Amino acid sequence: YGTQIAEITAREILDSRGRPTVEAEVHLEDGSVGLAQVPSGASTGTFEAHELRDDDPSRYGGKGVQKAVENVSAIEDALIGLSALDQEGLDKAMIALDGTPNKKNLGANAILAVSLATAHAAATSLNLPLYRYLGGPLANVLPVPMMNVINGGAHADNNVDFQEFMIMPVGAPSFKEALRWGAEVFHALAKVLKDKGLATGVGDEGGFAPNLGSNKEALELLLTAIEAAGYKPGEQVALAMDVASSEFYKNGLYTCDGVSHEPAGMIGILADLVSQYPIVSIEDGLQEDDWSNWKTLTQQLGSTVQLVGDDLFVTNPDRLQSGIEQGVGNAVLIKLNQIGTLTETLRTIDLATRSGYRSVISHRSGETEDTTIADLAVATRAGQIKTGSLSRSERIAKYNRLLRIEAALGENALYAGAIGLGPK
Amino acid sequence: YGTQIAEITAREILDSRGRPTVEAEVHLEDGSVGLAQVPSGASTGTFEAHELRDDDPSRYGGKGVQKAVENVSAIEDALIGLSALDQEGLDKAMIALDGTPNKKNLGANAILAVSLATAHAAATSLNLPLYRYLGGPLANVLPVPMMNVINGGAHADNNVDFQEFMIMPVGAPSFKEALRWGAEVFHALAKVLKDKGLATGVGDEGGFAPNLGSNKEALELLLTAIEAAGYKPGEQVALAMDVASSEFYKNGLYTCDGVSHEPAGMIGILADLVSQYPIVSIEDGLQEDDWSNWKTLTQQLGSTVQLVGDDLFVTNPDRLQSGIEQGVGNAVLIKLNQIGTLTETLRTIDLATRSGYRSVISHRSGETEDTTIADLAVATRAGQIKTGSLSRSERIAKYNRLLRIEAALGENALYAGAIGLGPK
Amino acid sequence: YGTQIAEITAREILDSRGRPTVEAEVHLEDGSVGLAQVPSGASTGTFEAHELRDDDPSRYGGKGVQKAVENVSAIEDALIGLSALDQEGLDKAMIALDGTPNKKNLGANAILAVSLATAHAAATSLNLPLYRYLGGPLANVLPVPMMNVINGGAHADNNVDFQEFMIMPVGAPSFKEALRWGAEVFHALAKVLKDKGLATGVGDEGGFAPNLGSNKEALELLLTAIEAAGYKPGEQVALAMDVASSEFYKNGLYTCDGVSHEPAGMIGILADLVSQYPIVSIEDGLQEDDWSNWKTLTQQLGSTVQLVGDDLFVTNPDRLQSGIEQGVGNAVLIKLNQIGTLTETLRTIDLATRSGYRSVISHRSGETEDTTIADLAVATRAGQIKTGSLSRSERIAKYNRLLRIEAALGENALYAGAIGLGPK
Amino acid sequence: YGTQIAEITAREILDSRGRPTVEAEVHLEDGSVGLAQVPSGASTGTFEAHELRDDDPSRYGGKGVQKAVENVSAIEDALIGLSALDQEGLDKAMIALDGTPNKKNLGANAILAVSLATAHAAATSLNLPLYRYLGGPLANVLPVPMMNVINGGAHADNNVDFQEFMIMPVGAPSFKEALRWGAEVFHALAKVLKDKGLATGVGDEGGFAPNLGSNKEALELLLTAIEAAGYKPGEQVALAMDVASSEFYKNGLYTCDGVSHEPAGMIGILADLVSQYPIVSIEDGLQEDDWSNWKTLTQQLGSTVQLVGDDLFVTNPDRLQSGIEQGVGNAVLIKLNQIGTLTETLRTIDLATRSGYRSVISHRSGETEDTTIADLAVATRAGQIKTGSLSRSERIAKYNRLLRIEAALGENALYAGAIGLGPK
């Protein structure tokens, strides 16, 4: 009785970009309160669960979420009296109430808010930390963070073709040290940008978008920053890229370094970068429907470098299943709000895990003060998290959460980077 | 017995700039947990309580807070067994244990962390929201926010002399609408900056630092943004400035718009701007110790314009007392970590309130996911809050907290701007 | 405080063979009681955790476990006051107290008894079913059972070379129906054995060991039984074998069907049987250290047939790691008492899961009334369980437990065989 | 209120032979859960309470118990709100709901399941062990076990006429030692069967059915096993027989040792065996309706040997009353499911006790993981239990239960064999 849902309330709040998003509050009969906020970023297309916007041009430029918030009222009517411990029944009941494949009726933002809020309330009722509620007694692995430092493509005003350049402190003895290494490299990068003429204003993720001339200049700048902070590139702090190749792809051709490339040219660019630079991960190296060439890329590089599908997989079990069947990729970016329930997100992580793919638990461009993905990462032993740069607390809050989880785990805490659960 | 302190733990976490800061966790015998994080900004000097840094050049560039964190262990030995409800006795016990005027032995950051954490724990034990625990049954006033949009001086690479230009939605019917107004004007500003080809990278506070030529260009841009969003400058969205005059003051001269001014010239510049632009508030318009000229400024502008002391007062009761006695300023920026206990912060707010000064509850440039200042603002009916722009969740989290307080207050919720508790 | 261990007691009881084994009783301060019994089978050698026997020839033929039972007293001194929820800390404390790699000081049987008992107590304290306590909110998969029906080799008096022939109801819609299918085929087999004048006395696992002439005669008999019960061989009820090849291996030669074979001949026998019979799984098809030939077997059959390591892996993370690296096997038999803690068993299952191996949770030939492996199977979504025939309650009790778990899961219950989590 | 029945649930599970049987789950308002399983063996005739089978040839060969399970739903409607402590009112309410003498409407299996489950729940509510709940503060007597070792008659393929040959460790100082003595003799028997050419496959009860030529060969084999284990036949380990004479009786003649005998011949066979072999008990020595010759047998042997009615009495008060009136038998086999309620079973034990007959609490051929009969034996100070051999955990579980009861009784524990409560 004590864990029965008594109240579900939703509210329009703002995300880290000053845009409306949804929060939900779940109260149980025993007085346990769960509170969760929903992130938001730019949709990739057809398989991403629908973020419901009001499209009222007189409120927040058409980006109000009053309809999503009101839809939580119909979710409250369906869910009152069910046990908060039955996460799966809860999620299945909202999926059935919505009645659409992409959650376009209730809104993925309405549904995910209640899904996460309920989980927080159930963890609190059992007096379990959320990582332990979600993952059981082996939820002890702190992820290697993918830490944004330089942006390009459509995330900048520069001549860098690739979207994001990241550092990964793979060689750190603990998450606490991993975070310090990332932070020292970020501040050494800031000093190197300022010492040159370059802008230090930060984008959505808390990193820099200086006017650089090429991808190579980006990578050489990270290596300069790592060296300046006193770390070995590769063994201690390695590099990773989000290519977001779909952004410079037109009719079988990839436009990169000023030249149009055939798929084999794009693959050769990625191969040359890998053989020169300590790059351990490449996300969306080829476009989201170029499966035959992803096959080639995976056969060629997949042994030595992590190949992450984001747009490729859209946190979708069917798309990940096809990828597994075709030897396409070896990792998947996990975005809760791309699929819209905690349950379906756990099903997708499980499919990836038991097929030998790495799960990288991901933020969106629009984040909140919510830290669920820190707990989700540790609960599923994912071993990797992508949650932005070393500035802006919608990003730092997840690192702070992971410090708290690592301290509570005591002698049981493992760092993915030291036990072979990091990038591969 | 239930409200007795059982445990105080501290940890080194990161602030919104990726710099170390302190958090404290207070547990009571009844199982109530309070958790608080400490902000940080650039110290103003003599009367600012000492933020204790490790000065180990091999960790976080000398900005570790391990010594502060360890000092919470000595605070735990002193405070275990005391009632969490005795905020004042708690704070006085840490002040006495430190034994220095500026808290340089334990660290203001160690002491404030326990002070805020204890208050959060005591509110939770009584099952009271923190605003109501801190302020009693008339804690019902949501503040007018001072929303950063353009930065200059030492917070930019431009030819704007003044540090900060803010919008204040004084004419809004509620905090919920005030926030929407701020957000729409911020996005209309972003569009106007991008349409002119000016940089949209954000600073510490989540606002813009474009390459503008003058203070007048900054104010003209805010007026353009307000008009573009469909709001009336002054009546609906008014302006405020942090001059941080001590940044361009040397040898009794203020350097501003490319000309050296005597104090009377600086005063005339502020007077001219006020008569031309709907500016309702000016912070640090003259340097922090130029009290004779502050007198003149206050006699001249104080009846029509709020004149805020930040560096002027450093949240110090002694300095604010002298300022009240000499007719200097008519408002004070309230920074918890400039004085280092909740108690002394409440004493400073009380002195300002009963002397007819306005209290503007303030962030620091280094913030965290902590939202205490939202509750402190409502608890003291301060009527104003300065917590940054409409981006970055260390700023947005305070707006979200105030949305939550406004909703819980229901029909009792008042907006400072509608009942004469806003800027004056 | 409520989940702190207050009492750990152990007792000498009997297993399903009338041999001494260990049970432990764990009491928490909140009055929660966990009770667990330890199985036993014939040790495989080096990497199997040491089962501590008394070797007093005047008690139970030297197979007393009084020393193991007394050693639980030293475990009680170490563990009193620790939280039952900290399974991993609990297990690590006993591993450290033992101080030997193979647990030969305390006894694997002493340590495992406390490890399982503690987990049962912690599940009861949280009022969680043990499957949900151990696995989180996606613990919803009922395994395909590997049901013993005919025995040979050193488990019989016949001319069948292979140790065990099993039916697997892979095509069943639910575990409840899978069990009924198994039972109907077992009774149809019993009738066919009695009609031919073959012995119906049962062995350790509750199956038959009739005087048959060959492996082929065994498989032909299972096909006859399946057809007689009205089921389709392969699609509905498929076959599996434990070859226990190390029983007929000497000097690089395997003795099978009366002929000496080289490894390539043994592989060809397994290949021929697979192409003729609906065999989906083969356990220990080659001897435990013949890794070069396991490589060949895995390359040849591994895409179409599950190849299970029992003696191959001995539930050891190091051995399973090497097997994964060298493309040896694609499944592992999970025996809690081969490694001696719940934690290390979960680590081994996790390694197998994220490397794309199947975990088959296993009984020992000496079982008890304990049903932990039913919950362990569902908690880890292992998808397969090996717990003996359709007779003897040390076997049936696990099926009954899985009926109880399937009913409690309601609409969330999945059968491994219907969702691709069965043999592959 | 706390001990009121809130929920009664039943389930189809499998017994030790892989045949369906009933389990019931009783929940009280205070959250106490009782769970019980019902055994099954071959009916003796008209006075045995009806085991309800589905007789659906397409499920479990016609031996489903879905109808019995569904009938627990009508029992739930009648019993919800009654106190679990009112065992007798509970049992009388189900007897009245059924409305038939032999429980053929609800099914003895439905009724007994709820009867035992309720008792388990009531013991748990009072935090009393079930033996103490059922028997009061003198429930301290551990029974002498009747341990099956060799089978014949219709339970074997041999030339042994009698059904069962048992060892009874009458001379043991405690139950714990009694169990070790039984176990050592069973393993010494297994070695002696293997050393000769004889089968070691086990039947329903966990004993052996080797191809022996006569009853005398069976008894001589037990004496060989006892001697081999180092025990004195008679004083330490004595013999007992279940003749099941009804199986070789036709029209006043008993067929035994190849010859047809008159009743006086059958009696002389039993007399000769007793004068030669240390036989302390004979069960069903004459057929279930041969009262006049049972009189003679009782007058002749009843002084020196226990004469147990099983088929003779069918756990029936009326039949036991006639037996007491005629000086027929001096012991009764107590089978809960032959009469169908705990209450009527206790009434039958009471009638036997106060008439100077011994109550031997009995398993069925089809057993489960249930251990109620261990507690029933200790509660009624019956002093004897018949629960099978030294293998198969549906048998060993009762011995394990009695180890637990003996340990909890501490210095209060008595062994029936040492205090004159064993066979007589």
Ligand SMILES: [Ca+2]
């Ligand atoms: Ca996207």
Ligand SMILES: [Ca+2]
């Ligand atoms: Ca796309």
Ligand SMILES: [Ca+2]
């Ligand atoms: Ca560009």
Ligand SMILES: [Ca+2]
């Ligand atoms: Ca991406």
Ligand SMILES: [Ca+2]
């Ligand atoms: Ca300052």
Ligand SMILES: [Ca+2]
């Ligand atoms: Ca100063």
Ligand SMILES: [Ca+2]
């Ligand atoms: Ca200032």
Ligand SMILES: [Ca+2]
């Ligand atoms: Ca073995």
Ligand SMILES: [Ca+2]
């Ligand atoms: Ca070996």
Ligand SMILES: [Ca+2]
């Ligand atoms: Ca095996």
Ligand SMILES: [Ca+2]
């Ligand atoms: Ca019978």
Ligand SMILES: [Ca+2]
């Ligand atoms: Ca009969």
Ligand SMILES: [Ca+2]
């Ligand atoms: Ca016969």
Ligand SMILES: [Ca+2]
């Ligand atoms: Ca009998």
